[PDB]
RNA sequence: CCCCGAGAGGGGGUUUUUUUUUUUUUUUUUU
């Protein structure tokens, strides 16, 4: 029971968007050159994410070294000031966070060509400065951008998106208010394809609605891929112009 | 700042502070400014070209009639834009089948009504949802439209910004509907709006005070009766005071019972107390109705019938619990706040004693409610002779400290007494029974 | 509650009670802990506050982590039986103490070795019917005694003093300073504090040498 | 006199001839005849890029040159590295790549040079000859299967570094050349490692004899007699290198000396770390190059 | 401690999949036969899937609810691994990738989903409540830990019975089972997990840019099949035809329609499993009642 | 320390810095700071925020959040939380800086806690969260500048209800939109390096490695204030220092601090 | 398979300890 107009009869949402529109998606490449080999600053809505890629480099412990592939590590730092109400405890060892880190690794292990970087380590540090729904999808986009900036080989883009289901209606790119009022589905889409790297459903969804929700997410993720690709060619082109 | 997007959509920052449990939270949400907000008028020939389909692939219907109620110049054909106050006060008149046919309800108004009253907001939405060929209500999302969206000026109260927002909507509607010769009338009781129009520096706008607007309609005499309106009661506490009182175990809320055998004594059911706390007196009841959720404060023990600090009040509370077990003396209290009124449309009849047949102008009369546990209400009317022997529906407006009786204004004329039509209809709606025919959306 | 300790029932609540210049003397003992290489007992009693702390030096022992031409030193303060301090505050004093003894310990004589110094704030009674500043000079005294008792080379007997929230540790007959600490206190009182602390430094150094020799 | 420069900004986290370009997953070609190189991957006829960069066509060999990435060792490169660890009969040195390079005990010129008989003892005692933290010149002798580099210092030109200061720039700003050791005005010598590691020292007799004692080729001791001007010259040269790097412009022996003399406008040296001077300096270097055409 | 898998074994098991063969002789869409055994005490349940052996134990004790939730009881699920299931598992390793995933799948399937009526665990609001604990013991590992645990937890919760409690004022009166019978728990729905394993018969290039999809997906993989898969999918449903949770945390990129097919295939399995659990619970109840009649008769 | 240098590099740097005309590797003067960039008010979710970028890539982010508390039970009204990326929460450097910073910004030491008081019973608790993304030296002064900038651009909710709990005891209610700017005087923390007999402001990474000692000196209300701490910037070259150096450092800060504050208190 | 001598010499292919769990807004039946 929600007293707010999550989806008005006029087809408008609480923030003004319609059913099908992505939130301001502003990417940023090479934000921390003196701190990492690759870096990206993501702004998807009110979400603010710093992503640092450090590597490939020498492992700090020879015990943890693979002679056939690189070691991929991801640590997500959800700051205590990410949400309106400051969290008293840290989230560093939170099971929810360990699953997120694990999830992200399992995603890019099959995309990043770790096999061509044996006896090395790729460390991915993430700092979530502000959170407002769809943080998982934003985490995916931040890593993909930062990895590319580091010149680390990968097969394709991985775009992340979230889709809510309020009653019958499907809502693209939901915020914190919408996620609190309905079940959401987080989708990671490889490139322009229909193949999902990540399918995440944590709340109840009717079996009949799931296929349609996936269809919305994939279409929306393709737009995220285009925006990421666009901003990347723009950054590339300028560098090429100035360097050459 | 404000960012422009690809769809011609804009986005800004809506930031407000909400107080919860003595806490202060800065809430910040993003606010998108669109460019495809339909006027929802049959006359319009531009909006249908820029409108887009809903999640269910359904374009919104333009319902506002191309030939609305025509009034004496310079009003002519016109649409009505409502203010927040005129909605909260005369929702009954807004449901009257004999007036308000084409009405535009701004988003900012709809939002304020939702926060101020939950119920009225539902009734207003029903009018929008339920629109037919007799009554037509829409919701123009003015806050989401880039053309009408205004932002707070330096050193400006939120109430003046919102009034300026509504006024901006009327101007936009006025300019937008010029080729169709349809003017817009702003029905508002607010003092503030007029000054901005008296200068008329930027644009013109026709605004009538609720009463002033009614006096411009063809059926003014038929709908004027629906216009909402040392003795002194102790003022109710401010809102902050009772919330802290409940939290500090000083004040207590519950449902009050008032018997028809005695209107000068009430009793509240409190969880902390075994036997119901009595409320003796008319000042102590403080304009409370039977079934109302009231907040009461325990009177001193010397007021008991058969303090300064909060500490003493909690001690008084304990002495009250002891006294209830002893069954010798019983604790009394006084209502200082009304949490939830049990008010609903009330059926009654004019008392022949308070109406003068010789009077031709407007006069004050009394109406005897069908509820024997309820007091009588004062009514301003001119058709006092036409409502003499009839079952009428009235709604309360206010019951302030300096008036011995609550004040109410008539809503509808059910009929003559002891007739099968009037008595059956009064019988149904007194027991909350919807007898109206099923809406089009239902059928 | 905890699966490694017995902390009792969770609904239990700790017992809370209700209501119904000055000369300083200290006692010194060394080498009473067979478990380690060097140890010291420092007890001080003055006015409305007495302190009994124990220091223990473990080293030089093996270092797994890295090659080193010189030695590596670590200092950890532990809360005692009743009086308690913030972990942050104990870490801060530990860092302050590390800087001091990295100026005194002849690290060159201990390649790829580790000298781990523990100071137990065993019994700190507050009888007044940042208090950590008054314990600092006694810590330095204990660590100096323990290191000397362990046989760890020292450039000079490092001692200290405290005056109005200001703590300063001296070496070389008070000619130079190996550490400066200041919390609260007043303004432009540096010169007065240095003199008062040097007096305590001199007294502590004499008693330390007297303890390392005669005992 | 200004105590500090602080640049402020509100409401924002941060400030904000045709060459082919491509992103990961983009289709480069559909000609199966091509031999796919680095930065690419293929499936039947389709060849896709494996990195963000420019498409390169050399003969029949299609490859995509990345925009960004660490220094990639090639055989014969002149690099400057720091000893990370010492184990067995080898030295592992930090070059700035994906992996540490190796430096076998065999390659280095032992004390007494050729005359001294090969010694069992030296392998045990190598730390004394070299140890963790030491800087040195080295040439990439060979390459391992993964791409790691094996170094050697079997020359008088190569060896332990001293009498100066270290600084580093992105390896992309330093390319291969006939020689990476250069003599500059002010009696100082630069060593421009291809890996981006740069060593600025006082010009030695060897540096002079290059364009015109074997027991002390691994000594840490700085020259006892190093003048302030030589020291103040080093500081000036180092800042200008950082300035060239700040403009993302590759360093040149000519660019360095040109900047060094052009920077003489500013009295105090500590005035070469500021951005305005660097921005203006960078443009000065570039306009002259344009004039040269 | 690693499990060494030869190239020969890797190539064989994968090639067998290309020929519609799996070593245990099952069908790509075939779920293992689930055997459920109840102990003497309520809440004691043993689940067996082929060689996979898991044991769950439900327990409860009087406790005080959190300040935030004065009307809700406490409920926790423990799934600590041990070297008993195999030396591959480190003792107490509760931060490993697979461990945290499994822990999170169960939590989102039972805890978060509200399978257990925590509101009915409250005795006196904001004072005293029941604290239900589900302890899963991984005895023998042959894959399908997530599916085995979800069944073990649910079967246990539905089989468990808590002792009657009467409360007056502060005092709590815990009635022993013999004096009065114990009370069952409140189950809002019955969540069942079905795990899919994905295999790429070709190379990564044909998975990313390949036209026709050829990735193989099997239901409820054994240990050998689990060690050679390229992607995992765990989908949880109930008889009410609703998805409780879906988790494809990375791995081999898979076609969306194929993932939907898996969800529909899993629904047919969870239906058979749910009915199976209910039947074994009825017979267990009939067994305990028949013995109670034979105990009273002779008595 | 952080940076790894050879014995030769350290000897050259030390001799250059220990010289009577002290020669800095970048050519700076013993009182010149390196250029920094500061961003503020970029976290709308928080009451205040800042981001400082050094010349060596060192980056620190500070967030300011508020909470209504009973000042009769909550002794500390300003809590500093430090998080250095790549370090454990219980690391020695982290806790030391955390303990130090909390003393620098105590309620009744270097901060006007009167501006945090709402009523006779309730006051505003200020949470200063520090996030060090990257740092190559002792980040204590870096964090200090960021906290300063953040606290000078912080906006708190405005009270509506009466300010006398003792009698009427009204529940704390605040205005829906208006916020009052936090007027306060944040202290600054300067760090110095001791190389021989010379004292350097804003020690670089390479400079700190060869330094004999160091000083941490706080600054508030136009004067030197506690906490004042001597600190070993490295651990291989730590030596005792003459008292006149300590007095020189305090004097050095006392004359160059207002210049820093002036460039930092810009409108 | 890899580096150094012109011809069956020599040198390398990379192993081991440190620090606990929560988590977002007046009965009954037909009417
Ligand atoms: Zn229109």
UniProtKB/Swiss-Prot annotation, chain B:
Task: Locate the coiled-coil region(s) and give their ranges.
Answer: none
The residues covered by the CSD1 domain are 230-342
Source organism, top-level taxon? Eukaryota
For the region Endoribonuclease, what residue ranges are annotated?
Answer: 1-227
Q: What effect on the protein does mutating residue 190 to A have, as reported in its record?
A: Abolishes endoribonucleolytic activity; no effect on growth. No growth
Domain (CSD2) ranges:
365-432
| Extra remark | Present with 606 molecules/cell in log phase SD medium. Mn(2+) doesn't support the hydrolytic activity. Activity is KCl or NaCl dependent and activity is slightly increased in the presence of reducing agents such as DTT or beta-mercaptoethanol and doesn't vary notably between pH 6.8 and 8.8.
Q: How does it assemble?
A: Component of the RNA exosome complex. Specifically part of the catalytically inactive RNA exosome core complex (Exo-9) which associate with the catalytic subunits RRP6 and DIS3 in cytoplasmic- and nuclear-specific RNA exosome complex forms. Exo-9 is formed by a hexameric base ring of RNase PH domain-containing subunits and a cap ring consisting of CSL4, RRP4 and RRP40; DIS3 associates with the base ring of Exo-9. Interacts with GSP1.
Q: To which protein family does this belong?
A: Belongs to the RNR ribonuclease family.
Q: What is this protein called?
A: Exosome complex exonuclease DIS3
Which stretch of the full-length chain is present here? 9 to 500 of 1001
From Swiss-Prot, chain C:
Name the predominant localization: cytoplasm
Q: Does the keyword RNA-binding apply?
A: yes
| Stored InterPro entries | ExoRNase_PH_dom1, PNPase/RNase_PH_dom_sf, Ribosomal_Su5_D2-typ_SF, RNase_PH
On the tree of life, the source organism's domain of life is Eukaryota
What cellular component GO annotations does this protein have? cytoplasmic exosome (RNase complex); exosome (RNase complex); nuclear exosome (RNase complex); nucleolus; nucleus
Q: Recorded GO terms, molecular function?
A: RNA binding
Record keywords? Cytoplasm, Exosome, Nucleus, RNA-binding, rRNA processing
Name the SUPFAM superfamilies on file: Ribosomal protein S5 domain 2-like
Q: Where in the cell is it found?
A: Cytoplasm; Nucleus, Nucleolus
Q: Which GO terms describe its biological process?
A: exonucleolytic trimming to generate mature 3'-end of 5.8S rRNA from tricistronic rRNA transcript (SSU-rRNA, 5.8S rRNA, LSU-rRNA); nuclear mRNA surveillance; nuclear polyadenylation-dependent CUT catabolic process; nuclear polyadenylation-dependent rRNA catabolic process; poly(A)-dependent snoRNA 3'-end processing; RNA catabolic process; RNA processing; rRNA catabolic process
Q: Name one Pfam family in it.
A: RNase_PH
User: Does the keyword field hold Metal-binding?
Assistant: no
Question: Which Gene3D superfamilies does the UniProt record give?
Answer: GHMP Kinase, N-terminal domain
Q: Which family does it belong to?
A: Belongs to the RNase PH family.
Further information in the entry reads:
Present with 7380 molecules/cell in log phase SD medium.
Its subunit composition reads:
Component of the RNA exosome complex. Specifically part of the catalytically inactive RNA exosome core complex (Exo-9) may associate with the catalytic subunits RRP6 and DIS3 in cytoplasmic- and nuclear-specific RNA exosome complex forms. Exo-9 is formed by a hexameric base ring of RNase PH domain-containing subunits and a cap ring consisting of CSL4, RRP4 and RRP40.
Q: What is this protein called?
A: Exosome complex component MTR3
Swiss-Prot record, chain E:
A single GO molecular function, which one? Answer: mRNA 3'-UTR AU-rich region binding
Q: Supply the alphabetized keyword list.
A: Cytoplasm, Exosome, Nucleus, RNA-binding, rRNA processing
Superkingdom, according to UniProt?
A: Eukaryota
Q: Which GO terms describe its biological process?
A: exonucleolytic trimming to generate mature 3'-end of 5.8S rRNA from tricistronic rRNA transcript (SSU-rRNA, 5.8S rRNA, LSU-rRNA); nuclear mRNA surveillance; nuclear polyadenylation-dependent rRNA catabolic process; RNA catabolic process; RNA processing; rRNA catabolic process; TRAMP-dependent tRNA surveillance pathway; U1 snRNA 3'-end processing
What is the similarity comment for this entry? Belongs to the RNase PH family.
Q: What else is known?
A: Present with 4800 molecules/cell in log phase SD medium.
Protein's job: Non-catalytic component of the RNA exosome complex which has 3'->5' exoribonuclease activity and participates in a multitude of cellular RNA processing and degradation events. In the nucleus, the RNA exosome complex is involved in proper maturation of stable RNA species such as rRNA, snRNA and snoRNA, in the elimination of RNA processing by-products and non-coding 'pervasive' transcripts, such as antisense RNA species and cryptic unstable transcripts (CUTs), and of mRNAs with processing defects, thereby limiting or excluding their export to the cytoplasm.
Name of the protein: Exosome complex component RRP45
Q: What is the lineage of its organism?
A: Eukaryota, Fungi, Dikarya, Ascomycota, Saccharomycotina
From Swiss-Prot, chain F:
**Biological process terms in GO annotation:** exonucleolytic trimming to generate mature 3'-end of 5.8S rRNA from tricistronic rRNA transcript (SSU-rRNA, 5.8S rRNA, LSU-rRNA); nuclear mRNA surveillance; nuclear polyadenylation-dependent rRNA catabolic process; RNA catabolic process; RNA processing; rRNA catabolic process; TRAMP-dependent tRNA surveillance pathway; U1 snRNA 3'-end processing
* Keywords assigned by UniProt, alphabetized: Cytoplasm, Exosome, Nucleus, RNA-binding, rRNA processing
Matching CDD domains, A to Z? RNase_PH_RRP42
* Name of the protein in question: Exosome complex component RRP42
| Subunit text | Component of the RNA exosome complex. Specifically part of the catalytically inactive RNA exosome core complex (Exo-9) which may associate with the catalytic subunits RRP6 and DIS3 in cytoplasmic- and nuclear-specific RNA exosome complex forms. Exo-9 is formed by a hexameric base ring of RNase PH domain-containing subunits and a cap ring consisting of CSL4, RRP4 and RRP40.
List the source organism.
Answer: Saccharomyces cerevisiae (strain ATCC 204508 / S288c) (Baker's yeast)
Q: Which family does it belong to?
A: Belongs to the RNase PH family.
Keyword set includes Nucleus: yes
- InterPro entries the record matches: Exosome_comp_Rrp42_subfam, PNPase/RNase_PH_dom_sf, Ribosomal_Su5_D2-typ_SF
Q: Which GO terms describe its molecular function?
A: mRNA 3'-UTR AU-rich region binding
Which gene name does the record give?
RRP42
Q: Does the keyword RNA-binding apply?
A: yes
Coiled-coil annotation reads none
Question: Anything else the record notes?
Answer: Present with 7110 molecules/cell in log phase SD medium.
Q: What subcellular locations does the record give?
A: Cytoplasm; Nucleus, Nucleolus
Q: What is its main location?
A: cytoplasm
Instruction: Give the superkingdom in one word.
Output: Eukaryota
One cellular-component annotation, GO: nuclear exosome (RNase complex)
């Amino acid at each position: 029971m929600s007293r707010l107009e999550i989806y008005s009869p006029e087809g408008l949402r609480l923030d003004g968007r319609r059913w099908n529109e992505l939130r301001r998606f502003e990417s940023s490449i090479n934000t921390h050159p003196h701190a990492a080999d690759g870096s990206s600053y993501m702004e998807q809505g009110n979400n603010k994410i710093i992503t640092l890629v450090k590597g490939p480099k020498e492992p700090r412990l020879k015990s943890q070294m693979d002679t056939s592939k690189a070691l991929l590590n991801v640590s997500v730092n959800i700051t205590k000031f990410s949400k309106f109400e400051r969290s008293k405890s840290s989230h560093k060892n939170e099971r929810r966070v360990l699953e997120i880190q694990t999830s992200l690794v399992r995603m890019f292990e099959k995309n990043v060509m770790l096999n061509i970087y044996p006896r090395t380590v790729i460390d991915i540090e993430i700092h979530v400065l502000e959170q407002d729904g769809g943080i998982m999808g934003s985490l995916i986009n931040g890593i993909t951008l930062a990895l590319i900036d580091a010149g680390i080989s990968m097969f394709d883009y991985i775009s992340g998106i979230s889709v809510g289901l309020y009653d019958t209606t499907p809502l693209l790119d939901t915020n914190s208010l919408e996620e609190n009022a309905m079940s959401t589905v987080t989708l990671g889409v490889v490139g322009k394809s229909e193949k999902l790297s990540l399918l995440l459903v944590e709340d109840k969804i009717p079996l009949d609605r799931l296929e349609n929700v996936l269809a919305i997410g994939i279409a929306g993720a393709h737009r995220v891929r285009d925006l990421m690709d666009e901003e990347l060619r723009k950054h590339a082109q300028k560098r090429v112009s100035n360097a050459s | 700042r404000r960012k422009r997007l690809a769809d011609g959509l804009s986005v800004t920052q809506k930031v407000f502070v909400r107080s919860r449990n003595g806490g202060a939270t800065k809430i910040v949400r993003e606010h998108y400014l669109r460019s495809d907000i339909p006027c929802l008028s049959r006359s319009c020939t531009k909006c249908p070209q820029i409108v887009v389909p809903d999640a269910q692939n359904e374009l919104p219907k333009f319902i506002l009639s191309d030939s609305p109620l025509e009034l004496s110049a310079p009003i002519g054909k016109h649409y009505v834009v409502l203010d927040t106050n005129v909605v909260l006060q005369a929702i009954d008149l807004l449901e009257n089948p004999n007036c308000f046919f084409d009405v535009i309800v701004p988003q900012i108004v709809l939002d304020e009504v939702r926060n101020k009253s939950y119920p009225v907001y539902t009734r207003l939405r029903t009018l929008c949802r339920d629109s037919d060929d007799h009554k037509r209500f829409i919701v123009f999302h003015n806050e989401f439209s880039e053309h009408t969206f205004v932002e707070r000026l330096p050193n400006e109260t939120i109430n003046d910004r919102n009034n300026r927002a509504i006024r901006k909507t009327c101007q936009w509607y006025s300019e937008h509907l010029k080729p169709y010769d349809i003017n817009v009338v702003l029905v508002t009781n607010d003092r503030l709006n007029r000054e901005a129009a008296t200068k008329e520096v930027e644009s013109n706008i026709i605004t009538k005070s609720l009463v002033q607007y009614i006096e411009l309609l063809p059926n003014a005499d038929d709908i004027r009766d629906s216009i909402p309106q040392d003795f002194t009661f102790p003022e109710y506490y401010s809102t902050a005071r009772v919330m802290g009182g409940l939290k500090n175990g000083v004040l207590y809320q519950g449902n009050i019972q008032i018997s028809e055998y005695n209107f000068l004594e009430g009793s509240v059911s409190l969880p902390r107390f075994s036997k119901p706390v009595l409320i003796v007196g008319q000042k102590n009841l403080n304009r409370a109705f039977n079934g109302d959720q009231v907040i009461v404060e325990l009177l001193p023990q010397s007021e008991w019938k058969a303090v300064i600090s909060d500490k003493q009040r909690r001690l008084l509370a304990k002495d009250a619990m002891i006294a209830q077990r002893s069954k010798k003396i019983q604790p009394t209290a006084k209502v200082v706040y009304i949490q939830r009124r049990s008010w609903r449309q009330y059926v009654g009849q004019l008392a022949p004693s308070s109406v003068d047949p010789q009077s031709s102008s407007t006069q004050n009369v009394f109406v005897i409610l069908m509820d024997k546990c309820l007091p009588k209400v004062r009514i301003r009317t001119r058709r006092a002779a036409e409502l003499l022997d009839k079952r009428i529906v009235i709604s309360i407006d206010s019951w302030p400290t300096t008036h011995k009786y609550p004040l109410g204004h008539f809503v509808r004329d059910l009929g003559t007494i002891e007739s099968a039509q009037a008595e059956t209809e009064a019988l149904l709606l007194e027991h909350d029974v919807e007898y109206r025919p099923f809406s089009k959306k239902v059928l | 509650q905890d699966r490694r300790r017995l902390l009792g029932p969770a609904a239990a609540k700790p017992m809370a009670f209700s209501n119904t210049e000055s000369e300083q003397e200290l006692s010194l003992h060394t080498g009473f802990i067979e478990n380690c290489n060097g140890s010291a007992l420092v007890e001080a009693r003055s006015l409305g506050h007495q302190t009994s702390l124990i220091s223990a030096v473990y080293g030089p022992r093996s270092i797994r982590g890295s090659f080193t031409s010189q030695g590596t030193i670590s200092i950890q303060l532990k809360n005692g039986l009743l009086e308690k301090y913030n972990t942050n505050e104990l870490k801060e004093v530990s860092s302050f103490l590390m800087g001091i003894f990295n100026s005194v310990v002849n690290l060159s004589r201990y390649p790829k070795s580790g000298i781990d110094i523990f100071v137990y704030l065993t019994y700190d009674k507050d009888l007044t019917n940042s208090q950590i500043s008054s314990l600092i000079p006694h810590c330095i005294t204990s660590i100096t005694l323990a290191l000397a008792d362990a046989g760890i080379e020292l450039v000079d007997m490092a001692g200290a003093g405290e005056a109005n929230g200001t703590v300063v540790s001296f070496i070389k007959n008070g000619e130079e300073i190996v550490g400066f600490w200041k919390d609260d206190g007043d303004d432009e009182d540096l010169l007065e504090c240095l003199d008062r602390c040097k007096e305590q430094y001199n007294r502590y150094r004499d008693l330390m040498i007297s303890c390392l020799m005669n005992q | 006199s200004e105590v500090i420069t602080i640049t402020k900004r509100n409401g924002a986290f941060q400030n904000s001839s045709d060459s082919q370009i491509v992103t990961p997953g983009e289709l480069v070609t559909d000609d199966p005849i091509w031999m796919r190189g680095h930065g690419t991957y293929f499936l039947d006829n389709m060849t896709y890029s494996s990195v963000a960069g420019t498409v390169s066509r050399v003969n029949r060999l299609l490859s995509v040159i990345p925009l960004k990435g660490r220094y990639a060792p090639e055989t014969g490169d002149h690099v400057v590295g720091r000893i990370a660890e010492v184990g067995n009969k080898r030295w592992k040195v930090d070059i700035g790549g994906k992996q540490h390079a190796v430096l076998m005990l065999g390659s280095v010129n032992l004390p007494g040079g050729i005359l001294r008989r090969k010694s069992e003892s030296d392998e045990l005692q190598m730390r004394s000859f070299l140890k963790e933290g030491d800087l040195l010149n080295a040439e990439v002798q060979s390459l391992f299967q993964d791409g790691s580099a094996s170094l050697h210092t079997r020359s008088l030109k190569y060896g332990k570094l001293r009498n100066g200061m270290f600084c580093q720039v992105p390896s992309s700003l330093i390319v291969r050349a006939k020689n990476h050791t250069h003599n500059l005005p002010g009696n100082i010598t630069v060593v421009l490692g291809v890996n981006g590691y740069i060593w600025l020292r006082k010009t030695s007799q060897m540096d002079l004899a290059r364009d015109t004692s074997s027991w002390q080729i691994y000594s840490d001791e700085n020259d006892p007699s190093i003048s302030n001007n030589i020291r103040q010259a080093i500081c000036r040269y180092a800042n200008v290198i950082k300035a060239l790097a700040f403009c993302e412009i590759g360093i040149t022996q000519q660019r360095i000396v040109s900047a060094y003399e052009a920077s003489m406008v500013y009295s105090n040296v500590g005035e070469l770390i500021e951005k305005n001077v660097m921005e203006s300096i960078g443009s000065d270097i570039l306009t002259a190059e344009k004039m040269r055409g | 401690k690693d499990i060494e898998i030869s190239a020969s074994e890797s190539k064989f098991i994968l090639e067998a999949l290309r020929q519609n063969y799996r070593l245990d002789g099952r069908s790509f869409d075939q779920f293992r036969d689930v055997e459920i055994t109840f102990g003497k005490e309520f809440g004691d349940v043993s689940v067996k899937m082929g060689n996979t052996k898991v044991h769950c134990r439900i327990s409860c004790q009087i406790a005080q609810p959190y300040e935030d939730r004065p009307f809700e009881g406490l409920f926790v699920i423990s799934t600590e691994i041990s070297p008993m299931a195999g030396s591959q598992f480190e003792n107490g390793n509760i931060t490993g990738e697979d461990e945290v995933l499994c822990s999170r799948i169960i939590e989102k399937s039972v805890r978060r989903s509200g399978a257990l009526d925590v509101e009915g665990l409250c005795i006196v609001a904001g004072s005293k409540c029941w604290a239900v604990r589900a302890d899963v013991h991984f005895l023998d590992c042959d894959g399908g830990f997530i599916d085995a645990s979800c069944i073990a937890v649910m079967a246990g919760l539905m089989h468990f019975k808590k002792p009657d409690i009467t409360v007056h004022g502060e005092q709590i009166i815990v009635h022993p089972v013999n004096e009065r019978e114990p009370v069952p728990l409140g189950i809002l729905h019955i969540p069942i997990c079905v795990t899919f394993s994905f295999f790429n018969p070709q190379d990564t290039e044909e998975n990313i840019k390949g036209e026709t999809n050829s990735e193989i997906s099997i239901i409820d993989a054994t240990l050998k099949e689990e060690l050679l898969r390229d992607g995992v999918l765990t989908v949880t449903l109930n008889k009410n035809r609703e998805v409780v949770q879906v988790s494809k945390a990375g791995g081999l990129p898979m076609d969306a329609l194929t993932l939907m097919k898996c969800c529909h295939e899993a629904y047919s399995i969870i239906e058979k499993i749910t009915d199976q659990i209910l039947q074994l619970l009825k017979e267990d109840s009939e067994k305990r009642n028949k013995y109670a009649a034979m105990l009273t008769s002779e008595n | 320390g952080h940076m790894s240098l050879s014995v030769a590099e350290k000897s050259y740097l030390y001799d250059s810095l220990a010289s009577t005309p002290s020669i800095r590797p970048d050519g700076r003067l013993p009182h010149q700071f390196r250029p920094i960039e500061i961003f503020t008010d970029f976290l709308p979710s928080s009451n205040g925020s800042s981001r400082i970028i050094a010349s060596d890539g060192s980056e620190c982010i500070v967030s300011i959040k508020s909470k209504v508390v009973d000042h009769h039970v909550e002794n500390e009204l300003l809590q500093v939380d430090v998080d250095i990326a790549g370090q454990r929460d219980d690391a020695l450097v982290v806790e030391t800086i955390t303990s130090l910073l909390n003393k620098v910004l105590k309620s009744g030491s270097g901060v006007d806690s009167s501006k945090l008081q709402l009523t006779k019973k309730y006051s505003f608790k200020i949470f200063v969260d520090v996030l060090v993304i990257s740092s190559h030296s002792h980040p204590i002064s870096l964090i200090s500048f960021a906290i300063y900038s953040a606290l000078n651009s912080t906006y708190l909710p405005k009270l509506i209800s009466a300010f006398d709990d003792l009698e009427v005891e009204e529940l704390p209610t605040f205005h829906d939109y208006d916020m009052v700017k936090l007027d306060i005087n944040p202290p600054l923390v300067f760090i110095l390096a001791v190389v021989g007999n010379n004292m350097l402001l804003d020690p670089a990474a390479n400079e700190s490695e060869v330094a004999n000692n160091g000083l941490i000196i706080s600054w508030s209300n136009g004067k030197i204030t506690s906490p004042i701490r001597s600190v070993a910037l490295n651990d291989s070259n730590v030596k005792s220092f003459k008292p006149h150096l300590l007095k020189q450092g305090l004097a050095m800060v006392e004359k160059y601090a207002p210049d820093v504050v002036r460039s930092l208190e810009n409108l």
